[PDB]
Design a protein around this nucleic acid. Structure first.
Ligand SMILES: [Cl-]
Ligand SMILES: [Cl-]
Ligand SMILES: [Cl-]
Ligand SMILES: [Mg+2]
Ligand SMILES: [Mg+2]
Ligand SMILES: [Rb+]
Ligand SMILES: [Rb+]
Ligand SMILES: [Rb+]
Ligand SMILES: [Rb+]
Ligand SMILES: [Rb+]
Ligand SMILES: [Rb+]
Length: 136
RNA sequence: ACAU
DNA sequence: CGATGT
């Protein structure tokens, strides 16, 4: 119903899907950019949305913050819940980097604990997520 | 259908 | 119009 303003919002951005993938996290209240991943030459939207949430988890844990995370990715929310990124992207030489980061993200999920709520950003009611890359 |  | 995913 209402936006939890005391929160972190994340989102992927891409050039092509599959294509060049990046992501970032912002303070929901102010839009301040809190982290940004350097672009990855080939990945999918869902892999980047997944990496963005996991990075958010690590970021908040390191800072002893109990803020929730907003994501507008139904897929990535489920993947993080499952601790398993069910991407269809081919594993080959040119996708090695994104797949390494996804594999390492799952590994982190499987070796650490967190209570961070991971919440659906309700775009239909609230407009676009504040971490969005005005590209779509 | 939904995330879009 | 094309894509990745449930
Ligand atoms: Cl990452
Ligand atoms: Cl919450
Ligand atoms: Cl969801
Ligand atoms: Mg998104
Ligand atoms: Mg977006
Ligand atoms: Rb900590
Ligand atoms: Rb966008
Ligand atoms: Rb957009
Ligand atoms: Rb669509
Ligand atoms: Rb969206
Ligand atoms: Rb579809």
């Amino acid at each position: 119903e209402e936006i939890i303003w005391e929160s972190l919002s994340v989102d992927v951005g891409s050039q092509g899907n599959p294509g060049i993938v990046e992501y970032k996290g912002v303070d929901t209240k102010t839009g301040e950019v809190l982290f940004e991943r350097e672009p990855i030459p080939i990945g999918t939207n869902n892999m980047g949305e997944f990496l963005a949430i996991v990075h958010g988890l690590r970021y908040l844990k390191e800072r002893n913050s109990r803020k929730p995370i907003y994501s507008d990715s139904q897929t990535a929310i489920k993947w993080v819940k499952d601790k398993k990124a069910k991407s269809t992207l081919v594993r080959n030489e040119e996708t090695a980097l994104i797949w390494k980061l996804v594999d390492e993200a799952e590994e982190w999920l499987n070796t650490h604990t967190y209570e961070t709520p991971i919440l659906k950003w309700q775009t239909d009611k609230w407009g676009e997520i504040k971490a969005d890359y005005g590209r779509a």
